[PDB]
Amino acid sequence: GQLRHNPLDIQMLSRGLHEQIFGQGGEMPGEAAVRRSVEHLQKHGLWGQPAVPLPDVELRLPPLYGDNLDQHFRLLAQKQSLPYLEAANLLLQAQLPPKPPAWAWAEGWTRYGPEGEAVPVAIPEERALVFDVEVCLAEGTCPTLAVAISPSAWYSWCSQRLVEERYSWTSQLSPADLIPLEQEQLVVGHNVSFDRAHIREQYLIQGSRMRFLDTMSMHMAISGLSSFQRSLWIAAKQSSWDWLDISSVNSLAEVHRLYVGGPPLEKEPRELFVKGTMKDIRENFQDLMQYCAQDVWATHEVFQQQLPLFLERCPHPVTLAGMLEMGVSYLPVNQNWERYLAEAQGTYEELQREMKKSLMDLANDACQLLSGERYKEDPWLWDLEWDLQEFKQKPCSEEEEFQQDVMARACLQKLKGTTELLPKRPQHLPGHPGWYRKLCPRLDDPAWTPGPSLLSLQMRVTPKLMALTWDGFPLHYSERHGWGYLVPGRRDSYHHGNGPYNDVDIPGCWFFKLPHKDGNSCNVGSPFAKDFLPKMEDGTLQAGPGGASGPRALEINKMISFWRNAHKRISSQMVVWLPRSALPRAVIRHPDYDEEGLYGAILPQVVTASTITRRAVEPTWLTASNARPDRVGSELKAMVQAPPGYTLVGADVDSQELWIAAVLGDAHFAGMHGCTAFGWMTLQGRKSRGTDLHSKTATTVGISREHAKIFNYGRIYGAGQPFAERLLMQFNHRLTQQEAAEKAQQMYAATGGTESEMFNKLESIATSDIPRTPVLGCCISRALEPSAVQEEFMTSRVNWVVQSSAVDYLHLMLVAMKWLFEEFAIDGRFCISIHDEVRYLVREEDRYRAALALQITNLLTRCMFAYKLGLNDLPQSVAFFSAVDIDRCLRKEVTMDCKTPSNPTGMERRYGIPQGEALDIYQIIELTKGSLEK
Amino acid sequence: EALLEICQRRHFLSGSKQQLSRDSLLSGCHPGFGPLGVELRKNLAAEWWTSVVVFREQVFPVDALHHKPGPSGKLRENLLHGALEHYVNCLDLVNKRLPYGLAQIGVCFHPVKSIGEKTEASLVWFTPPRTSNQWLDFWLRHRLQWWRKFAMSPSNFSSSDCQDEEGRKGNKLYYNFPWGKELIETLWNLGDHELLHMYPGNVSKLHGRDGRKNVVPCVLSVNGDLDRGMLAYLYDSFRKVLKLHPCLAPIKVALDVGRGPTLELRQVCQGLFNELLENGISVWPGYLETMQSSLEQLYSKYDEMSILFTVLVTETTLENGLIHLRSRDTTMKEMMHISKLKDFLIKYISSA
Amino acid sequence: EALLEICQRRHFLSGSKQQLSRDSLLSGCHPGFGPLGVELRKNLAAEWWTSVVVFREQVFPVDALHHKPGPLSGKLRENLLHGALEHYVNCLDLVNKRLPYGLAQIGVCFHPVSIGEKTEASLVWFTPPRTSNQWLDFWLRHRLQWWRKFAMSPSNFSSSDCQDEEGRKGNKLYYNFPWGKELIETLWNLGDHELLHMYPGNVSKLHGRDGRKNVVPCVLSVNGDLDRGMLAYLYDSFRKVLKLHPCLAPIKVALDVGRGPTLELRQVCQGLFNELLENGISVWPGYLESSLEQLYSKYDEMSILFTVLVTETTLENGLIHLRSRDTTMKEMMHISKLKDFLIKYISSA
DNA sequence: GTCGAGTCTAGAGGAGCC
DNA sequence: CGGGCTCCTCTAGACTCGAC
Ligand SMILES: Nc1ccn([C@H]2C[C@H](O)[C@@H](COP(=O)(O)OP(=O)(O)OP(=O)(O)O)O2)c(=O)n1
Ligand SMILES: O=C(Nc1ccn(-c2ccccc2)n1)N[C@H]1CCOc2c(Cl)cccc21
Ligand SMILES: [Ca+2]
């Protein structure tokens, strides 16, 4: 039969799949290992529990190359990453003639031969290049000038916007507006995603073979720093400290200093591309172009120094092939993007005004406490600045009516000419108290508005104006301690909380800090945080005006908090709208084609490995919020909509780090699966039935599964019991302090224990002389090795094993997906890879083939993880993807309609975006007949 | 009750307490508005026009007769019929491209039998059937935002979804008066029923271009009550003050005069009066008052009238051009040179 | 006939071409006004309001209703005088019992022809009897000047003196239409008859301060037809061209485009359109869509002041073709200088 | 030449993601 | 001892430049 079991009764892979993947002739665990496993499981009360047999899966997988799975992965990655290593070698071997003495003021691409001469060319026509692109920020996002380094000649590029001055330029960019380039081609740069974002041919829907290498990514791969380490490094540049001399920050100057060394690099103090105008660039063309050439030369030197070190400390071809495929992200968009920006900004402005009206009214009403010195009896506003300035100085007939009008106008005009004694800059509201003037915008301000408009909830006078109160005591701000409240009664306490402070010393009252969500060590910045909404509902935090003023203030703050912090990021996204000729025939011929609708693409500015764990970073898309009922502009990802004839076929890995930690601990205990209590708990479950670890935690404590994620992952990586107690009290306000502590004990009682073996294995990898990834064998940054930091930064290094293993998981998934898509001719391409979620822009006709490829990829990756750990087997519980989402827009669930304050009609009504579908393995097999061919 | 006393005392409302019952105001059986009430209503109509007709390429004004003769005549209860009577002729302006609207502010006569006159603002939006719900939602949001952008308490304006006896979709705006909610605006997604009834025969006459397709437009009708909305803003505005919006306060500035010399200060005040009037700013000439009262009494009077600024031209203006400006919102006084008054007053209002 | 055809075709007067009637226009039985006619009448009402109410401290608006509740079964109002007289007493508190003081209103008047509606601007002036004739001549001169101000041929705006049945003095303003002279305004010195009729007994409420003595005023009635004013100005302002005064012409600027690119030119035109609208200049968005001659003829028939054309050249240097309706001449001027030019031109009109 | 109003910088606390 | 990132607004302080 196709059903298999292990000596611990965990159902393993199907017989056919296990035969094709692991081959035959394995080694049994043996008697002693099984006895230890059984004793451990029985002591922890898990042995003998039956589980529902998941159906056996039969697949004729594509013919794997080599003699085992690791050789298969190596051969795939080498074939994928062979020409680009050749291009990098071409970059490493050859040198360059000296930079031209005088650049060229011309449009297009010019080739600099020896002695600085320039020759007009169409494209550089090089397999390998080093790229740096400069953009005039004030003008817009169009590229201004660039320099390309080639093993044979220098290259310079200038846009027609710099060469030619016009009254107006298009604010919506086009492929013809970008830098022309591009069988394989490699382009290197310090932050190459920015340079890639300005290439004309990168915005085509169909993919291109050009790839991009980043020196920040390789810097973090070889010798990076943590955020705390970066802070300490910058503090030092202005117990262990040997890591300082072997690491640097991702600034090109510091990277060049660390890897090449020499005279420090210089940057133009005028900042003619950031703070300057186009005329400054035209006048300062030679200096700016020379600085560009200097930067590209420094990048070339750093790349030459970095490539061998990276290929040594990261020897597996899979890592490089994944980093190559991780920087070709692509996000398709349309006119709904512009509509979304407009609607989000309008809703934000409406809510902002609505919030500011109440604050302006309260401020205006309080100005009357100036009279009679009544402000010193106000419990809230007795501390502000109430001082006043002074003003500073250095029937008549038609003929009779006309004469009277002329005399009146002349008399008025004579007085209007007395400005000689008048200072030129008008004094700001001299007669209004200072606290008022500060809130009132100055007249010259381009965007001026009447009233104390500069007022917001984040300021330090808003709680005093709104007369906010905590349990009947007025709020009060202390610089040393943040926000608090004054409890009257000092006779120079009947209240308990963050305790009396003798530091503040407000006569006749004690001072108590507001209880912060992260303990008595932290300070509260504003009483309008999300944590204080339950306290207002409970009546502890009250507003003086009463009614719904406080609740409405906090609700508006919650609604507009994300857009306030992300509208610069989102509105500034570079969108290149393809014309009709650039689009494929499939999109044009599709029924859902909109002739009056724009179609474009956003290329995320992704740094492939910008983490000590080699996780990618992106300011907008990897921080992009999901659609929520009460968040302005939270439908951001839902605006990433596949073109007509295309769908987004993607999936998210299920319980990734839990499984990686469990499999490590199991391979540490005995060479099988489910050896430990933690691995057995992880394996025995199903996300469809709500019996996975996150769901089980979300049931055992009244927190949600999303919060259970944080709870479990904090428990793994060093969160003590007080942290768990704070999280429980935060996510479940019904829990008291004593009740929250009890559940913290319950979840941390058995941690000889349930999670002992994984802890031991992680400490073993961390304390090793050269810590390396257990699967792909990639070494830790040189600034975290025991020879550098010794025992310090332990939590970072222990979490590094699992997180870098997850990055290896992503690399394996990308390589396998590329192989499967190339082998069977699946018309699709990589869309975006958040940390553990991979999205693929696939054509409509091949969504189910893409789903089958994704499931096969996940199966093969889990088998590779098991093989590298010596287990030589994979359970059926974690074999495949629970649900592969086939959708047109980009959202976590295919069912949500994404109703937000900016989009209250939902995605189905406002736009033509139907709901998608989430499919398991069996549905995919039935749909595609178990084959990836056409 | 205090608000109605102020409104009748400051000539927002006419009559006595007999005809000032809230039922009389809501019905339309009250006597005419006072001059300040007329000015507040006219500013409300101007703002409505600016928001609906001015900054819209597809909207044109329309003229509908107060009576509809033929089968003895009758007065009009709604502006929708007259607007639909102009659909074919106003198709020519937009080159038969939808959406396009017709707008009108007028008085409609309601049976209360007595007749209660209501001033109503109406917009008739001809939209293709495909996007009718989208345009209904857009206009609901736009109108609710318009009502809320002049309100000291925008939460008192609400929208409720509703359905007709034929199942046609629509929305109803409201203002929460102290006693309860009263309807101030209504939107209805009427189909082609009224258009087809009013234009029987060939339907190619009614075809409008939905992009590249000809289609009969669904009639989205928006109808708002300017009298009840004016009373809503009066209640929202209401130390006794009427914090009406700077764009809605009937009189923007009040001009006064200080101590002697009287003759020269009168000339200065008259010149400033002419300047502010030529610059589109309504002025209350308090320098003409003979029964002079104290500064506090004038301040209370101006506050009840919703006077944004009080200009006090004194003898010191004759020597250095300095005038004293008091603001309702802050009750604080400031001195600004006489040359910069028109600029600011135009800036303060336009930026509101 | 040709003028009425142009008005119907260019959306000044609504209805069918044959539905157009001189007598229906003169009596108020016409179906209504097209958008351009509505804007022209609104401009005329604004000019009248600025002339009378805004620039004076004694003239105030009133809100007389359209109906007359109570026994004489109410009826439609026939004149705006009665509402002003009803407002006379309680509005004396506005002027602190000072005389003279006036009430003005532009409303809808219903007269028995069918039923005709005439939009009429009326001013009711309360005068101590000594200076009634002086104020009557003052208002006669000012109103005739206001009517003549916008006219291309202010000789056609005539004035005449008459007396009513009781013999009270009163003038009558007129306009000389092509068929003949038609009444556009009328002044009468009615006296205290109506005031005493509507306020029997207790003359203390009717008194007013005139040099520290109490006086019952004499009403001066100044009543003019704005619809007839609109017709008079259309006839006075007429190559097919409608040379309306800039303070009256409904749409001032026509904004168009040339050849491609369509998107960038449309963006420039939208920016210009919004900039002009932000400063009170009415525009015709003709860029949302023929030969230049046809567009210019259409704009001339619509009383368009200036025509602006945005072409490919505008992107390179900002020059826009500018055309004047009064003088058939074309000039090129920069975009940023167009708004100030239009504002100046309207102010200098 | 002396002081008061713009400008840049840095830190602190909040808020998005996996 | 949660870990890894990202960016924002508000405020205090040092500095710079202009008007009297
Ligand atoms: N607060 C968090 C969130 C995430 N992670 C890490 C651990 C996860 O393995 C990885 C991906 O996070 P997910 O939220 O996707 O967690 P899972 O993929 O395990 O959950 P699911 O089964 O819902 O996909 O990020 C973490 O350490 N702490
Ligand atoms: O809303 C505003 N905005 C601003 C912003 C700067 N301003 C200014 C104006 C002149 C000289 C200095 C400064 N004014 N100011 C109101 C609020 C206080 O009260 C008044 C008064 Cl008494 C008169 C006029 C305006 C106001
Ligand atoms: Ca996941």
Residue numbers in the entry:
A (entry chain A): 67 to 248, 262 to 317, 343 to 498, 532 to 629, 731 to 989, 1051 to 1233
B (entry chain B): 67 to 137, 178 to 218, 229 to 354, 369 to 482
C (entry chain C): 67 to 138, 178 to 218, 230 to 354, 369 to 419, 423 to 482
What does the paper say about this structure?
Mammalian mitochondrial DNA (mtDNA) is replicated by DNA polymerase γ (POLγ), a heterotrimeric complex consisting of a catalytic POLγA subunit and two accessory POLγB subunits. In addition to its C-terminal DNA polymerase domain, POLγA also contains an N-terminal 3′–5′ exonuclease domain that is crucial for proofreading during mtDNA synthesis. More than 300 mutations in POLG, the gene encoding the catalytic subunit, have been linked to severe, progressive conditions with high rates of morbidity and mortality, for which no treatment exists. Here we report on the discovery and characterization of PZL-A, a first-in-class small-molecule activator of mtDNA synthesis that is capable of restoring function to the most common mutant variants of POLγ.
